[PDB]
Amino acid sequence: GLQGHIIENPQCVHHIKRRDIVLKWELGEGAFGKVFLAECHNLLPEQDKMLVAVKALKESARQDFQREAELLTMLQHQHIVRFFGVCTEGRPLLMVFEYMRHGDLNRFLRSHGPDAKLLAGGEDVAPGPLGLGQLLAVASQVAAGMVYLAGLHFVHRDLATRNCLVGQGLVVKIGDFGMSRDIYSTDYYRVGGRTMLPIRWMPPESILYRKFTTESDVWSFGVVLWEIFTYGKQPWYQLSNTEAIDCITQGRELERPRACPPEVYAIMRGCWQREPQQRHSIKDVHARLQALAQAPPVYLDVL
Numbered sequence: 001g002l003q004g005h006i007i008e009n010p011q012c013v014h015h016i017k018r019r020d021i022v023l024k025w026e027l028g029e030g031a032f033g034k035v036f037l038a039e040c041h042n043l044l045p046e047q048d049k050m051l052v053a054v055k056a057l058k059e060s061a062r063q064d065f066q067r068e069a070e071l072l073t074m075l076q077h078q079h080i081v082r083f084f085g086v087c088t089e090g091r092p093l094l095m096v097f098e099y100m101r102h103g104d105l106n107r108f109l110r111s112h113g114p115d116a117k118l119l120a121g122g123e124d125v126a127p128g129p130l131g132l133g134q135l136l137a138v139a140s141q142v143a144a145g146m147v148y149l150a151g152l153h154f155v156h157r158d159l160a161t162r163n164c165l166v167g168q169g170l171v172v173k174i175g176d177f178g179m180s181r182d183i184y185s186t187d188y189y190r191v192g193g194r195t196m197l198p199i200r201w202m203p204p205e206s207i208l209y210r211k212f213t214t215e216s217d218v219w220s221f222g223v224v225l226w227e228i229f230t231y232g233k234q235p236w237y238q239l240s241n242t243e244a245i246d247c248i249t250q251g252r253e254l255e256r257p258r259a260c261p262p263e264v265y266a267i268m269r270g271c272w273q274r275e276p277q278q279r280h281s282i283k284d285v286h287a288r289l290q291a292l293a294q295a296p297p298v299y300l301d302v303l
């Protein structure tokens with residue numbers, strides 16, 4: 001079905017009473033519904049009242065909602081956005097997620113870019129552009145989520161920074177509320193009717209043959225690594241959608257970002273081997289990123 005829609009995977013759901021959810025205000029909006037900030041009571045022992053993100057269904061839908069809830073409940077990992085469960089008592093149908101204070105990683109990258117000064121600094125992040133060690137910590141975390149999805153044989157098909165969230169202490173997790181085509185329409189190619197393909201993130205076998213695997217996700221992860229080291233720039237931004245299809249199917253690679261050490265660009269190139277079976281595993285890409293994120297400053301300073 002839709003690239004990046006969890007029910008594209010063919011592999012218990014917690015219920016929350018409507019009275020325990022108090023909507024505060026809207027956070028975002030798309031064709032399939034809205035996301036609110038809400039207070040959720042009686043959800044976690046430590047917290048009598050905590051903030052959550054609530055996704056309200058705009059309403060087939062109820063059967064898609066049921067299979068989404070099943071698959072979200074099955075995902076339990078430090079770098080997948082936490083799903084608390086559903087409110088099916090009347091309407092609208094609600095899904096309850098942890099609140100990720102910094103929003104999506106593309107927005108977070110662009111607001112800590114090469115132009116950032118003292119004012120960009122805050123609780124969680126230093127002033128000025130994100131440093132090598134912070135960029136590596138972001139990439140490591142997204143890779144760890146992708147290790148977990150690969151271990152469960154899930155394929156994402158729309159992995160991009162816009163589809164990752166950033167929380168307190170710069171925790172980064174894979175997740176979205178199904179509105180990236182509404183909020184970031186320029187990141188998709190419209191192919192008639194309603195279909196919208198994230199071509200700039202897709203390998204040749206996906207664009208040419210419509211094949212999607214663990215190995216096409218690793219390609220997409222390579223593109224995520226490029227977005228991180230460009231502070232959120234669009235891949236192929238100088239190109240039209242058809243120009244980008246021509247570049248990707250002809251074997252052109254994204255150029256080393258200014259902020260990317262050769263060792264890291266080598267990790268991006270391992271994700272971009274033309275032949276899927278020749279790309280490095282997500283386990284290996286994650287081991288190499290984690291090692292660099294955790295490396296002492298004396299080592300990172302000469303990278």
Ligand SMILES: Cc1nccn2c(NC(=O)CN3c4ccccc4Oc4ccccc43)c(-c3ccccc3)nc12
Binds near residue numbers: 004174
């Ligand atoms: C309509 C639609 N079009 C595209 C993507 N859409 C999503 N997005 C995802 O399914 C992304 N997704 C995910 C996908 C694939 C593997 C693992 C995944 O882990 C997650 C973990 C937490 C949140 C989300 C995911 C939704 C949607 C539905 C209910 C709840 C939330 C989001 N609806 C859509």
